[PDB]
C-alpha cells in the first residue's frame, strides 16, 4: 500500500524459475527509419528532430534481418511498438495506411510462425503531429477518445495474434521531458501545469483502453494489458537518517508513484503530491478513482538509462542515485501489494564507438539479472519475464546516434545495415539456453 516501500531503506543463484519468459525489445522511432515512406504521417519526433536536434536501423525495410536476429537469440517474446502515424497518418481513424498495416501484420505473422510471443506497445512517444498541432496533443483531453479509437482498431486487427499489450511506454518521460525540461518532443519548457495535465490525460487514456480491452476483447482474445512505468532507484546518504529516507521515498513517489498509485494502487495520486502540487495536479473525481484503479493485468517495469540520464530527469532530493534493481523491485512489491512483474526494459548503453565488444553491457546484464534472481528467490517478488533492451542499435532520442543500446550492432553508414551480434548478444543467447548463468 501507499508508503509501505519506505521500509526497504531499513552469485548465490544461477538458474531462473523453470520456463522463465525471456525477451527483447525495440521502439518504432528508434529502429524503423522510413519516416514518411508509403504515406506514413509525421510524428512529433520527426518535427522535433528537424527543429531541436542536429534511416537508423531501417527495420521497416529489413524485416527479415530483424527476424534472423531474433532467431539467433532464441527469445520467447519480442516487444515492439506500433508507430501510430504509420498506421493512421493523421491520428484519427480514417482510412488506415495499407502499407503500414501490411508491415505490422507481416511482422506479427512472422512471430506467430516462430512461436515467439508478440508484446505490442501502442504508444512509444511518436504522437502523430496532426494531433499535436490541432489539439496540443496530450495537453488536450480530446486525446483520450482519439487514443482509445486507435487502440480499438489495433485490438481488432491484431489481438488474435497479440496476447500482451502495453498502452504507453514510460509516461513519466512523455510528460516530464516533453513538457517540463523540453528535452523530448514536443519540447515545451517550464509549464508545470502542462506536465501534470499531460500525465493526467495519459493515465485517463490508459484506463479507458484497459476498460475497452477488458470488456470488448479479453473474453475472446484472452490476453493481458498493462502500461510500462519507468523509474530510477535511490538510497539515503545517511542510513540512520529518517529525513534522508523520507526524501528517498518522495523521490520514488515523484517518478513511479505519480503513475503507479492511480493504476496499481488506490486509484488516486500519492497523497503527498496532492498537497504540495495542489495548484497544478488535476483532481480525480470519486468516480474516476474507481475507474483508474486496477487497470493493469501485470506490472510492467522499465529500469534503464532513460530514467537516470540526463541529470534533470528526476529529483534526487539530496540522496544517492542507485542502480539496485533488486531494491527497486522490492519497493514495487511493497507499494503495490505484490503484483506480477514483467521487466519491460532493462539494460544500459555504450558510447557509439563501441561496436561489438560491449563488455560493459555484459557486466551490467550479469548484475541486473543476478539482482532479478535474488528478488525472485530471496524476496518472493513475482517477476515472470525479462526484456533485454534493445534488439539493435538505433536512434536514441536526444542522444541520437552518439550512444548504442542494441544487442546487435548496426553500421549506420552501411546501406545493408547488417545486424551483427555483439558480445552481449552471444551472452544473452547463452543465458536463454541455460535459463540463467552458466552451469
Amino acid at each position, epitope marked *: 500500500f501507499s508508503g509501505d516501500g519506505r521500509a526497504i531503506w531499513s552469485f548465490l543463484y544461477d538458474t531462473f524459475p523453470k520456463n522463465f519468459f525471456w525477451g527483447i525489445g525495440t521502439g518504432a522511432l528508434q529502429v524503423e527509419g522510413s519516416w514518411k515512406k508509403d504515406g506514413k504521417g509525421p510524428s512529433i519526433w520527426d518535427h522535433f528532430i528537424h527543429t531541436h536536434l542536429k534511416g537508423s536501423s531501417d527495420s521497416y525495410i529489413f524485416l527479415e534481418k530483424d527476424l534472423s536476429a531474433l532467431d539467433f537469440i532464441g527469445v520467447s517474446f519480442y516487444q515492439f511498438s506500433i508507430s501510430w502515424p504509420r498506421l493512421f497518418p493523421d491520428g484519427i*481513424v*480514417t*482510412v488506415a495506411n495499407a502499407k503500414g498495416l501490411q508491415y505490422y501484420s507481416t511482422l506479427l505473422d512472422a512471430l506467430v510462425l516462430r512461436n515467439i510471443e508478440p508484446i505490442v506497445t501502442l504508444y512509444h512517444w511518436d504522437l502523430p503531429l496532426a494531433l499535436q498541432e490541432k489539439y496540443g496533443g496530450w495537453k488536450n483531453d*480530446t486525446i483520450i477518445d*482519439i487514443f482509445n*479509437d486507435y487502440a480499438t*482498431y489495433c485490438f*481488432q*486487427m491484431f489481438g488474435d495474434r497479440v496476447k500482451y499489450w502495453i498502452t504507453i511506454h514510460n509516461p513519466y518521460l512523455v510528460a516530464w521531458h516533453g513538457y517540463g525540461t523540453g528535452m523530448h518532443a514536443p519540447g515545451e519548457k517550464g509549464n508545470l501545469a502542462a506536465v501534470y495535465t499531460v500525465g493526467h490525460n495519459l493515465i485517463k487514456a490508459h484506463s479507458k483502453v484497459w476498460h475497452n480491452y477488458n470488456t470488448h476483447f479479453r473474453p475472446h482474445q484472452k490476453g493481458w494489458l498493462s502500461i510500462t512505468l519507468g523509474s530510477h532507484w535511490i538510497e539515503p546518504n545517511r542510513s540512520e537518517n529518517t529525513m534522508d529516507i523520507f526524501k528517498c521515498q518522495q523521490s520514488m513517489v515523484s517518478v513511479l508513484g505519480w503513475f503507479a498509485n492511480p493504476i496499481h494502487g488506490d486509484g488516486d495520486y500519492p497523497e503527498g503530491m496532492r498537497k504540495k502540487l495542489f495548484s497544478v495536479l488535476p483532481i480525480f473525481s470519486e468516480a474516476e478513482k474507481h475507474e483508474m484503479r486496477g487497470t493493469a493485468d501485470f506490472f510492467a517495469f522499465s529500469f534503464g538509462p532513460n530514467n537516470f540520464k540526463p541529470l534533470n530527469t528526476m529529483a534526487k532530493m539530496g540522496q544517492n542515485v542507485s542502480l539496485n534493481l533488486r531494491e527497486a523491485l522490492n519497493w514495487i512489491k511493497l507499494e503495490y501489494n505484490n503484483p506480477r512483474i514483467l521487466i519491460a526494459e532493462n539494460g544500459w548503453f555504450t558510447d557509439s564507438r563501441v561496436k561489438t565488444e560491449d563488455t560493459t553491457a555484459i557486466y551490467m546484464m550479469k548484475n541486473f539479472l543476478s539482482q532479478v534472481l535474488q528478488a525472485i528467490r530471496l524476496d518472493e517478488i513475482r517477476v515472470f519475464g525479462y526484456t533485454a533492451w534493445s534488439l539493435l542499435d538505433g536512434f536514441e532520442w536526444q542522444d541520437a546516434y552518439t550512444i548504442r543500446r542494441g544487442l546487435f550492432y548496426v553500421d549506420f553508414n552501411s546501406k545493408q545495415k547488417e545486424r551483427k551480434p555483439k558480445s552481449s548478444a552471444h551472452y544473452y543467447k547463452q543465458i536463454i539456453r541455460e535459463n540463467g548463468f552458466s552451469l
Partner: nanobody
Amino acid sequence: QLVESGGGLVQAGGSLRLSCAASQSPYVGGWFRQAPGKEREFVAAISWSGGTKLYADSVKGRFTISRDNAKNTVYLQMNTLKREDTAVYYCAARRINEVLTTAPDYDFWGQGTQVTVSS
C-alpha cells in the same frame, strides 16, 4: 439490429435529428442516403469513441454526428436542411474501427427512414 428514428417532413432551412439504436462489441456508426433517381451515397460516420467524425462534402458544416454508447445510439443532427437533402436515410455499422465512406465496407444496415424537405 439497427433501428432508425426521427425522420419525417420538415421545412427548408429547418432541423431534424435522426437516431440509430443498436441491439448489442465496438462499431463505427454510419449514415447513408438514397434520393429518387440517384444511387445510395455516404452522409456521415463516427468512430467507436467519437474521436473521428467524417462527413460527405455536401453536408459538412450543416450536419453533426454524435453518439452515446451507454444508450447504444448514434445521432445525426441535420441543420439548415435543403430540398436536395430529401432521401431515404439509412443507418449502418462497421465493426472494424476505421471510418470509411464506402457502402461495401458496412456490413450492418437499417431499414431506412424517409426525410422530406419542402420549400
